[PDB]
Amino acid sequence: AEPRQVFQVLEEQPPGTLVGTIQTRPGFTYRLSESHALFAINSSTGALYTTSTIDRESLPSDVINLVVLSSAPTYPTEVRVLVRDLNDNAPVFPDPSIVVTFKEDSSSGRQVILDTATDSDIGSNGVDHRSYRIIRGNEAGRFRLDITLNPSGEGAFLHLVSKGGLDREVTPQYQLLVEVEDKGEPKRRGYLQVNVTVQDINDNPPVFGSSHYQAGVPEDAVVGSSVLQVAAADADEGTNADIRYRLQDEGTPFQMDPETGLITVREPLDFEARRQYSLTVQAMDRGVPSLTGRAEALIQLLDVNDNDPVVKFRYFPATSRYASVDENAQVGTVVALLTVTDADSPAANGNISVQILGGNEQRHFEVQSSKVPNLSLIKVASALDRERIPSYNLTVSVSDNYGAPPGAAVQARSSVASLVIFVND
Amino acid sequence: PQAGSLDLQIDEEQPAGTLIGDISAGLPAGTAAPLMYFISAQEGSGVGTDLAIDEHSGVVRTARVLDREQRDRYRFTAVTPDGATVEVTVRVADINDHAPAFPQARAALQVPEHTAFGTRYPLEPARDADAGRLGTQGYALSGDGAGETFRLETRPGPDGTPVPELVVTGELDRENRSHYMLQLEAYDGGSPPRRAQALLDVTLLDINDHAPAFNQSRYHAVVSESLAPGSPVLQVFASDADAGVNGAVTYEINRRQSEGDGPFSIDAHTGLLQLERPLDFEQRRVHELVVQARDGGAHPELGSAFVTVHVRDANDNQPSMTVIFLSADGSPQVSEAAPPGQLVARISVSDPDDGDFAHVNVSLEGGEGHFALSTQDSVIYLVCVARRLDREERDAYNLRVTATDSGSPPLRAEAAFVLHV
Ligand SMILES: *[C@@H]1O[C@H](CO)[C@@H](O[C@@H]2O[C@H](CO)[C@@H](O)[C@H](O)[C@H]2NC(C)=O)[C@H](O)[C@H]1NC(C)=O
Ligand SMILES: *[C@@H]1O[C@H](CO)[C@@H](O)[C@H](O)[C@H]1NC(C)=O
Ligand SMILES: *[C@@H]1O[C@H](CO)[C@@H](O)[C@H](O)[C@H]1NC(C)=O
Ligand SMILES: *[C@@H]1O[C@H](CO)[C@@H](O)[C@H](O)[C@H]1NC(C)=O
Ligand SMILES: *[C@@H]1O[C@H](CO)[C@@H](O)[C@H](O)[C@H]1NC(C)=O
Ligand SMILES: [Ca+2]
Ligand SMILES: [Ca+2]
Ligand SMILES: [Ca+2]
Ligand SMILES: [Ca+2]
Ligand SMILES: [Ca+2]
Ligand SMILES: [Ca+2]
Ligand SMILES: [Ca+2]
Ligand SMILES: [Ca+2]
Ligand SMILES: [Ca+2]
Ligand SMILES: [Ca+2]
Ligand SMILES: [Ca+2]
Ligand SMILES: [Ca+2]
Ligand SMILES: [Ca+2]
Ligand SMILES: [Ca+2]
Ligand SMILES: [Ca+2]
Ligand SMILES: [Ca+2]
Ligand SMILES: [Ca+2]
Ligand SMILES: [Ca+2]
């Protein structure tokens, strides 16, 4: 009253495979109990045979209980069939290729948790979680594999430890492949790809294209014109590459466009105010911790003839309206001085001419360019009469950029003044 | 000769009328003594109100207090009535009148930590008013920590005044040394050196240095089945030594690599792991988790730790059973008074098991004594016939099987049938 047997059979076998022979009784016919499409029993004192190929992984449970039948009293002996594996499935990762991001310039020890492969087969025929290897991509020798196994039978974790030295500017991406092997009679393999995309950190500062910039500007430049153009570059990517230019000392009459780097004339210039400006330009990146690069910028102003010359006289008396000269003034004595004043530089004002107009351009008394460049002497080159000519109204001229070649852009600008002379003895 | 040249000099901010010189010394030696010195100076670029000249004698004196800050040297030509010329030049000598001075008495500087050695930070220099050797000169750093971490290298800026540049040296980490209180001093030329001082509060910025590190690498628990959902499991701990948002640790739970994280959830800012639905050992044996923590802010660093929650079972799952009748067509029946010592059905017991595998005792209700119960291997049961089933004024018998679980609490399972002739 206690007969019970157990049979064992392999999977993925052609139909009709002999499982086992149930013990027989003389004169009895046995058949199945409930109809299922996996087995059928030979009643002629036979055995148990499969009727179809079956994949063990496709079953809800391995062991399957079956009940026999009998002729008259229908005595039932129970039968259990165990189906195994043979390792027909290979290890497979949940996703073939994923992307992980690493922090560049980070010390050794930075890691990331990766996916662990799984195999549909049984325990022994399952994935060997201690056999993970990285077979390609790591030819540079940057990373390593660290596997953390769990005290619970169901669980495993894999790490991707970086040995430091990661630099985006040298190599921003690594494509790695992992080879995992099924721990089976047939060692079947699985693969996973890792797109390692390192992230950019602001480690490089902006650098200018030149160390010293030189440019010449005419002082007649209108407000808004261009002075010079600076250019910088940053080896980083994205936000750490956006450069903002600025003039280190924006108190000058210039202005820096914070994006193009074009120094413009913000206020009207003048050469006689200042000759040249020794500026310094900055270059600031938009990184999380900002950096700055510098370079000197020299701007030379170019003079133009925008100031006219004047002539002021000093004659025989000081606090007097009109000059006075004695009649017996011996020939060769100085009367007044021709002081020619010009504020502009000679580089933009040329040679200065002085001629006689409306007076005595008639050897009545000569004018002489003294040994001093601008100063001239007013003497008495002759003895004269008092009643005939008791007074004079001598005026002179003075021209900027005079004696210029034809078609010259340095046009002349002049101004005339007068000084009178009286004979009072 | 017929001309001459003469140079002069005078000190600064000396009272008016102070002697400058005499034009007589500039005339050629042996020339006649002139009766009047005609003065010719550059108009508007000139003597104007800043010199007094006696025409009949040639002596020169200062018209007002003299400042060379506006005008350093004067030049003018004196002419005699005879025609001789004396090119005169007067220089104003410098004296230390304006001491150096800083625009900020206590300036503040902000420098990121872990900065590269030798990167330079310019500062506001002490402007020199008295130009030449008397202004300008050199800075000396008197703050503490200047011998190892912060040195000063001078650089000449615009118009030649020296601009101090604080260079970076040594260690810089706000996790240890937060800020420095430096002091700057500026001197100048001249036998009595004028000085100016100012303090500098150098503070170190913070950067994402440290990733959230956990209290222990892996945690443990042994919660039972059917635990209260609102009850806690365990609390994790993580630290981050940075400041600001970089010190804020937000605890989360990885959903990918964790196997069994369904019934669980973690509090965001306390690390308290709490379940949301009850778990079953007769469904899930153990839960393996991976928790994380984010270094809050721009581009967060990531820490991680493991959680292992074992489960021990309780007898809460009712016993199961299946019945198949062994007489001809599976449908329940019996013959007109069947022979004795005959069986009409088969019963097999099963249950979600911890402790005693299976081993359940069945309680077949009576059957009025014409039926019996037998067991094969304490797991499969049978149904026998007794008393020949005489059919004494009886057609069918309603029968029922009761599965009695062999656990600490009583767990029953009903299963009724009808057996006819
Ligand atoms: C004569 O001297 C006078 C100054 O007293 C000069 O100034 C001119 O004077 C005349 C007097 O009739 C005026 O009509 C003019 O308007 C004044 N200015 C100018 C620019 O001419 C005068 O120029 C002298 N004479 C000449 C011929 O130059
Ligand atoms: C059972 O096996 C025997 C083996 O000789 C065979 O003769 C018989 O035909 C088989 N049963 C059936 C129904 O074919
Ligand atoms: C990883 O790189 C491969 C290269 O071809 C690409 O096909 C794949 O889509 C990448 N992974 C993801 C998640 O995009
Ligand atoms: C931290 O700074 C102090 C100075 O305040 C120094 O003595 C110490 O060595 C520093 N820490 C380390 C680990 O060097
Ligand atoms: C860190 O973990 C241990 C492990 O149980 C615990 O005893 C300790 O209280 C934890 N630290 C804090 C600050 O709670
Ligand atoms: Ca299979
Ligand atoms: Ca298999
Ligand atoms: Ca396998
Ligand atoms: Ca880098
Ligand atoms: Ca970078
Ligand atoms: Ca950058
Ligand atoms: Ca001008
Ligand atoms: Ca000009
Ligand atoms: Ca001119
Ligand atoms: Ca002064
Ligand atoms: Ca001075
Ligand atoms: Ca000084
Ligand atoms: Ca930090
Ligand atoms: Ca941090
Ligand atoms: Ca999951
Ligand atoms: Ca359950
Ligand atoms: Ca339970
Ligand atoms: Ca139970």
Residue numbers in the entry:
A (entry chain B): 43 to 467
B (entry chain A): 42 to 462
The authors write:
The atypical cadherins Fat and Dachsous are key regulators of cell growth and animal development. In contrast to classical cadherins, which form homophilic interactions to segregate cells, Fat and Dachsous cadherins form heterophilic interactions to induce cell polarity within tissues. Here, we determine the co-crystal structure of the human homologs Fat4 and Dachsous1 (Dchs1) to establish the molecular basis for Fat-Dachsous interactions. Fat4 and Dchs1 are two of the largest members of the cadherin superfamily and contain 34 and 27 extracellular cadherin (EC) domains, respectively.
The binding domains of Fat4 and Dchs1 form an extended interface along extracellular cadherin (EC) domains 1-4 of each protein. The Fat4 EC1–EC4 domains are positioned opposite the Dchs1 EC4, EC3, EC2, and EC1 domains, respectively. There were direct contacts between Fat4(EC1):Dchs1(EC4), Fat4(EC2):Dchs1(EC3), and Fat4(EC4):Dchs1(EC1), but no substantial contacts were observed between Fat4(EC3) and Dchs1(EC2). The Fat4(EC1):Dchs1(EC4) interface was oriented similarly to the Fat4(EC4):Dchs1(EC1) interface with one notable difference. The equivalent position of Leu379 for Fat4(EC4) is Arg387 in Dchs1(EC4), and this arginine forms a salt bridge with Glu120. The presence of an arginine at this position makes the Fat4(EC1):Dchs1(EC4) interface less hydrophobic than the Fat4(EC4):Dchs1(EC1) interface, and we speculate that this difference may be linked to the reduced contribution of Fat4(EC1):Dchs1(EC4) to the binding affinity. Within Dchs1(EC4), the Arg387 residue central to the Fat4-binding interface is highly conserved across all species sampled. Thus, the EC4 domain of Fat4 is indispensable for binding to Dchs1 while the EC4 of Dchs1 makes a minor contribution to the interaction. The alignment of EC2–EC3 of each protein revealed that the EC1 of Dchs1 is tilted by ~35° towards Fat4, making it the only protomer that adopts such a pronounced curvature in a protocadherin-like binding interface. This distinctive conformation was observed in both the high- and low-resolution structures.
